[PDB]
């Protein structure tokens, strides 16, 4: 994730201009190779047309250029591209919102699972760790960066997310499908045991715990579903073919013909085709942003910080349910006990 | 479902190009026959115009070609097609999200329905199987693949989803409508009986069970409603007629006329009309993807894996509520008990 | 409702072509009269221009035709039409989703309202019938077909939805507004009485009953709000005027002028204007589908089957809460007690 | 609100044509003055060009007309207008859905707050009246019509919504912000008191009451937020300037020039510019509908019936919680105790 | 926030015209500098072309102008700009809806945390202050204005949001991530303590408190996520580059060439290019509104009133939970105890 929210807090005079200088997570970083290749094939064609083809070959190439120029517009680049990009962006935001977080569960566990002794500490820490382990399992299933960090379940064990006994239970389970849900069932069983033992003092607290756990597990399952149900490959292939075919047609009809032939719209020979290069920049950049966002769990600069989120969630959950449990400051009267650096339209 | 999420994890140099080689779940597989037929009727027309029609017939055909070329654009292909495809894609994703899953119910049942003896096992397994049977009944009602797998209720009985006594109760029910809801009523009655018998220890647990069951049954009912309330047939007919009429008009006005006649925009005779074939490819591919996604429960390559989901859900639910019930690893201190391979914009 | 989901289960070679033959719920059925009238006024104008007007009148009519042809495009038909159709389709789906269904309530009542005797039967049946009666009252308020089926409250009484005593209570209520909510208040009072009498064994069950009843009543109220708050009449008038004015301008400028005058773009006299008739077909069909969907509770072929839904809901609710109450099959071990005809991208 | 849902129940032959005759809540009523002014300035310009300007001035005006005609299209009227209208319509529907209604609260209060004596009547009536008073306070804050009906809190007191003692408590509260939330806090305190006194028999009932009250108060707060957070004034100014500038450019380039000068596209002098007047009608009508819907609580014909809703809500809530409390008809066997005027695609 | 809802309550004759005069939160205020710079570079180019370039240089500049005029349209300004603006506006409204408010929590605390003595006052005030402190911490993390108001945690302490002991606990927590969640864990612990001590009389009340607290904390976390996950920088860079490149191309091809050369479409030399300046106004205004809304927590005129909201929330929460606790007016019969200044379409 490349963050620039603070730089755009106010609409200043040079508001978005100062963001053009950034390289990390930039359009240039994602598209400079493609732009260079496009310019290379254009100049190769230009050099051929200028210093290779004969007069008759030149005339035929000019006729072909003028045709490819007037019909290359039959390729519905904008229509398919816009549909595809909108779909990808909606999926991108939904996928980010589907990443599990323990904050709700950690608050519920701090307020519901009781005991200052070692057993209560164990209960709270184990519940938070079960949630974190479900998150880690799903993320390594769906995230290339997380999988590179946890290439095996042994890595998960060595990171403190899974114990050795828990690893034995996890492996001995006879299932051919992803087992990310297993820690959620462990969480449900442990919450039931805590309620039975009296650590959870009321049935409503257990129901709230189970509801929050179901929300968390549903987020993990949504992550799994988004990973499994990709954007239909037909749309990806169609958009890629549309971009490639349109830019090939532009490579031929964006050629600058000899002005001496008197062709209409061919009087100025700039040599380098700026507007095609700008048009290629914009359209190929749209497609490249779609490629980056299509799987937001890879290792792109603007992809999600899944490992950072894992570490933050684990640390914060442990802090909240272990160190800050029953550790309030004595009730003290606030500043305004005795009391800077709109009502309505009709009023 | 054809999955390619891992191949697109990072926006690489040849990012989407490597996906053009796939055949299964591809645009080529869905559209090669239609493209071949379109090219066949175009060349038939071209051969007729070239070697059959007389000079006067050729002149008249050229006039007709130039007219069909300048007005074929009055057919609002893009407008209707975009509206239709957006509607279909939204329905496709909603329908996928409407497929019932037992994960929430299985977690609740593992944490709420108690007993290590055979009776508790029976309760948990029967509840999970009632949920799975509701899912199977609705899916065979709405999915052609599932129906082919379960052509009769006897097949459902032989798969272990329904017992013989349950089959007798199911058939003896005097109803002329789909009975997918019957297992949900069985689930409610069995949950009430378990609560009465003490297997469910508190009323809040029963309420949570009923809420999760209602979520599951609502997903099944949404599947039924999506199956029943098709996309309005008027839109389907209009889009199909628009595509057919536009491509017939293109079959006549995309003809390459004899350049010797001096018609404007007719100087290069390529023989094969690439841009029309590319335009046909893109628009007909849009429509074909809409056809594939309109019923995502068929047997298209990119359709949902309903049978795989059925098997996975059954296996996972049985595992969670039978083998992993009250089977936790003893509470063990984690790695960080005593403690790799952003704060805000204003900060 | 015209259903064709099964015919489109797989994207076959002639996928959507086989749907063009359907008449019921078709574009032809909705638009053939309008198309015939449009063609009639066009040919009347054509016959006048061909065999009535003099040479000078013909020249003036040709000038008028060429003007109406180049400016008729200033009417933003596509823009307003697309906005209107999107609004109408979104409202159509939301309205369908707002139709109350007793499935959730029937499951809750089967699992919560107890008693195998006649009193428990009466409680369950009366609650389900109160829900059904609220649905019927709202539907006859908003649905022309339902009102034709229940033109008076006496018809509701004779259908078994309302009793005579309930009819007296309903009529004696001093209210000038729609009373569809009255059965919901009756349901709340009856649920409270059942809880007090012990038929509902716990307060959580009563809370769940009330929550489901509130969901049902909210769906009925949403139906009422959709019926009351129509799509703004300004948009309807604007879209209708846009279509009418554009097609009148086309009736004059889509005329085929005498080719002997040498007007540009007027060399081929087809007599029947196909592309205008196709353009009229598509745009007027869009508008006609909007008209059909604007009130989905009328008696159009593709409108909702409100009466079928009423009958199905009543029958299913009665079955679930009367015949299937406490009528489970004895707990039997399933097939797989002792155990056909993906994990992640990073894996 | 102008309702025409019944007139459009079925897609008849003259479906939307019969709605063009309506005046109330019509496009003509909202736009006839603007159309008259536009036509007045056009004819003033036409009369000047025809009978005032000299030959040289006429030639210069013709050159200016032909320029303003070919570039007036650089003003992105459709783009900004469509974005703005979509935003406004979405906000319009959301605002309507944000209007509080007591139906859920009234059902909960009828089923949960008990007592046939005067004290129970007082409790139920006071709770319903607190909800209604919160609605009234927010509406008079945000609705010009409601404020005209309740220009002062004394008017609220005299309407029976607030008592004199409640008015003293309301005024003595030291707050500089809108106090619409005060009746919600009164409702919470009164519900707590009723639960303590035994009128509410269980804690779950109190929780349900508080949840419904929070839903109601959230709707009131959403009304307040929509009133406060207007559509960004930048968008309003931009759209207004775009419409004004485009129609001024049309006022100059939609002029009909003397055909004797031989200007291309200027052969027919109609005098009155129909297509510009139709284009002005459509675009200015779009903008005027946006103006009407931007604040749906004013006194436009199609604005919400806030006062009618206030009266209906108060009357219905009082009826439900006072007259229909514990007033059920004796449980009677229905018509079908002993038992008119689809299953699935795969089946 | 600039509010104009009351001025647009009714669609008056000069409805939106009277809003063009506003300066604060206006398009002029945001765009006058950019418009002045654009006009400056255009006139510099115009003066160069008029009084510097020679005849041959003038001819070459005219050829370059006519090219940049016909191809500057290959830059997809509208497409990318519309996508970007829609994304930004959706995020803007979602971010506003994500701002935490204590109204629900304050109602729950008033109705659930009991005691007229000093201890109950302390409990209620401390809970409301914990919610307010979480809001303040998140806002100063994400809002530049709030951070300027609270540049350090010492400022938070001196504002009464945090006590000195609470500050010590907050700082002693070993965490490298944003601690806005810490007051939420304090709230959960304090609610648990209040329930244990008997201030909260039932477990359902505690569950409701925890649910409302989780809603509040989720809103704060959504604020954090929106601040962190900016709109992808690739889209920002692409839109900025598109606008800059299009307007540079317009700066060259919007030049007015010498009419004596007989270039087509160059007969009238206005000197100042109005339509380009209007087109620049509209497109750059779209982009500038996007810049303003991209971070709605800055100090733009139309940005959110975060400090006002903080003050209002604190004051209202304190009032509701301290002064209005158990301070109802005695139950009094209303005006209509003994009883101004639609039913359905089928009816
Ligand atoms: N004929 C041409 C038209 C346009 C361009 C270009 O701007 O790239 C190049 C050549
Ligand atoms: N006249 C023609 C115009 C275009 C095409 C084509 O690209 O297919 C073919 C013929
Ligand atoms: N001049 C005309 C242009 C088009 C049409 C038509 O296709 O209907 C008819 C006449
Ligand atoms: N030159 C003109 C072009 C169009 C119109 C018009 O239709 O209003 C008027 C004049
Ligand atoms: N050739 C030109 C075309 C248009 C404009 C303009 O309206 O700004 C200026 C010059
Ligand atoms: Ca990626
Ligand atoms: Ca299909
Ligand atoms: Ca209809
Ligand atoms: Ca208004
Ligand atoms: Ca800003
Ligand atoms: Cl609950």
């Amino acid at each position: 994730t490349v963050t620039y929210t603070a730089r755009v807090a106010n609409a200043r005079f040079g508001g978005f201009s100062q963001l053009l200088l950034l390289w990390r997570g930039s359009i240039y970083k994602l598209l400079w190779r493609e732009l260079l290749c496009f310019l290379g094939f254009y100049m190769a064609l230009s050099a051929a047309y200028r210093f290779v083809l004969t007069e008759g070959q030149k005339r035929y190439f000019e006729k072909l250029v003028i045709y490819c120029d007037q019909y290359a517009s039959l390729i519905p680049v904008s229509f398919v591209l816009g549909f595809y990009v909108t779909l990808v962006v909606n999926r991108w935001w939904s996928q980010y919102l589907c990443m599990p977080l323990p904050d709700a569960l950690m608050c519920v566990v701090a307020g519901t699972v009781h005991g200052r002794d070692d057993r209560g500490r164990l209960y709270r820490r184990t519940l938070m760790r079960y949630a974190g382990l479900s998150a880690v399992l799903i993320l390594r299933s769906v995230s290339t960066a997380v999988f590179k960090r946890f290439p095996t379940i042994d890595h998960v064990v060595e990171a403190g997310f899974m114990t050795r006994e828990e690893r034995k239970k996890f492996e001995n389970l006879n299932s051919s499908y992803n087992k990310y849900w297993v820690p959620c069932v462990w969480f449900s069983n442990l919450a039931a045991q805590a309620r039975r033992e009296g650590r959870i003092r009321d049935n409503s607290a257990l129901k709230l715990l189970l509801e929050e756990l179901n929300v968390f597990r549903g987020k993990c399952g949504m992550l799994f579903h988004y990973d499994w149900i990709s954007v239909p490959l037909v749309y990806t292939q169609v958009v890629t073919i549309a971009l490639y075919s349109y830019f090939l047609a532009c490579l031929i009809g964006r050629q600058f013909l000899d002005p001496a032939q008197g062709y209409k719209d061919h009087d100025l020979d700039l040599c380098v085709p700026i507007f095609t290069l700008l048009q290629f920049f914009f359209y190929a950049g749209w497609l490249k942003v779609a490629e980056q966002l299509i799987n937001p769990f890879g290792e792109d600069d603007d992809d999600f910080e899944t490992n950072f989120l894992i570490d933050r969630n684990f640390q914060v959950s442990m802090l909240a349910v272990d160190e800050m449990y029953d550790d309030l400051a004595v009730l003290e009267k606030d500043l305004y006990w005795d009391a800077y650096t709109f009502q309505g339209s009709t009023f």
Side-chain angles (χ1 to χ4, degrees), chain A residues 45-62 65:
Chain A
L45 246 200
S46 197
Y49 170 56
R50 287 156 183 278
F51 321 123
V52 181
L53 317 189
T54 74
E55 287 316 283
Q57 317 210 340
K58 289 176 120 291
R59 311 287 96 80
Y60 190 77
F61 183 73
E62 288 141 25
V65 169

Side-chain angles (χ1 to χ4, degrees), chain A residues 67 70-71 74:
Chain A
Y67 164 77
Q70 54 161 329
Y71 296 114
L74 298 172

Side-chain angles (χ1 to χ4, degrees), chain A residues 142-159:
Chain A
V142 312
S143 183
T144 72
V146 180
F147 186 79
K148 273 187 247 234
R149 182 183 174 189
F150 302 104
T152 54
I153 295 294
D154 308 19
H155 290 76
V156 171
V157 175
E158 263 89 57

Side-chain angles (χ1 to χ4, degrees), chain A residues 12-37:
Chain A
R12 45 195 74 61
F13 175 39
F16 283 170
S17 302
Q18 39 105 33
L19 295 175
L20 297 188
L21 296 181
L22 304 171
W23 175 255
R24 175 161 173 271
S26 55
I27 184 67
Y28 332 114
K29 175 188 228 146
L30 280 182
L31 200 63
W32 73 264
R33 250 170 252 120
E34 283 96 329
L35 263 156
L36 229 42
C37 309

Side-chain angles (χ1 to χ4, degrees), chain A residues 42 65 69 253-257 265-266 272-277:
Chain A
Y42 177 104
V65 169
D69 207 3
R254 288 335 218 310
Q255 292 299 319
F256 285 101
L257 299 180
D265 302 305
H266 300 91
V272 157
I274 318 297
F275 296 105
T276 309
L277 268 180

